[PDB]
Amino acid sequence: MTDLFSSPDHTLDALGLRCPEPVMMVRKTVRNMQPGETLLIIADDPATTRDIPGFCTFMEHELVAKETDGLPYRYLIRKGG
């Protein structure tokens, strides 16, 4: 397993954030992100592990690396389409 969470191009705190707030931060970040880039995202909210990423997948983004080894969760997402 290689480390894909390397220094990402962007970040999204979602610890204490809850849908749609977190999924929302990735949205605006997705709007300011570029295809071929990366965004690390943390989330302690239980609805972010499912909504934040479920959102990136819906906008044509990529989940570069997920983290569920125990809250807070984390997920990298390479902006793209």
Curated annotation (Swiss-Prot):
Q: Where in the cell is it found?
A: Cytoplasm
Q: Does the keyword Lipoprotein apply?
A: no
Swiss-Prot/TrEMBL keywords: Cytoplasm, tRNA processing
Concerning InterPro entries, the annotation shows: Sulphur_carrier_TusA, TusA-like, TusA-like_sf
Null allele phenotype: Cells lacking this gene are not capable of growing in standard laboratory rich medium (i.e., Luria broth), and show filamentous shape. FtsZ-ring formation appears to be severely impaired in tusA-deficient cells, resulting in the formation of a non-divided filamentous cell. A tusA deletion mutant lacks the 2-thio modification of mnm5s2U in tRNA and has a severe growth defect.
Q: What does this protein do?
A: Sulfur carrier protein involved in sulfur trafficking in the cell. Part of a sulfur-relay system required for 2-thiolation during synthesis of 2-thiouridine of the modified wobble base 5-methylaminomethyl-2-thiouridine (mnm(5)s(2)U) in tRNA. Interacts with IscS and stimulates its cysteine desulfurase activity. Accepts an activated sulfur from IscS, which is then transferred to TusD, and thus determines the direction of sulfur flow from IscS to 2-thiouridine formation. Also appears to be involved in sulfur transfer for the biosynthesis of molybdopterin.
Q: What protein family does this chain belong to?
A: Belongs to the sulfur carrier protein TusA family.
The record's subunit annotation is: Interacts with IscS.
Q: What protein is this chain from? A: Sulfur carrier protein TusA
- Taxonomically, what lineage is the organism? Bacteria, Pseudomonadati, Pseudomonadota, Gammaproteobacteria, Enterobacterales
Coding gene?
Answer: tusA
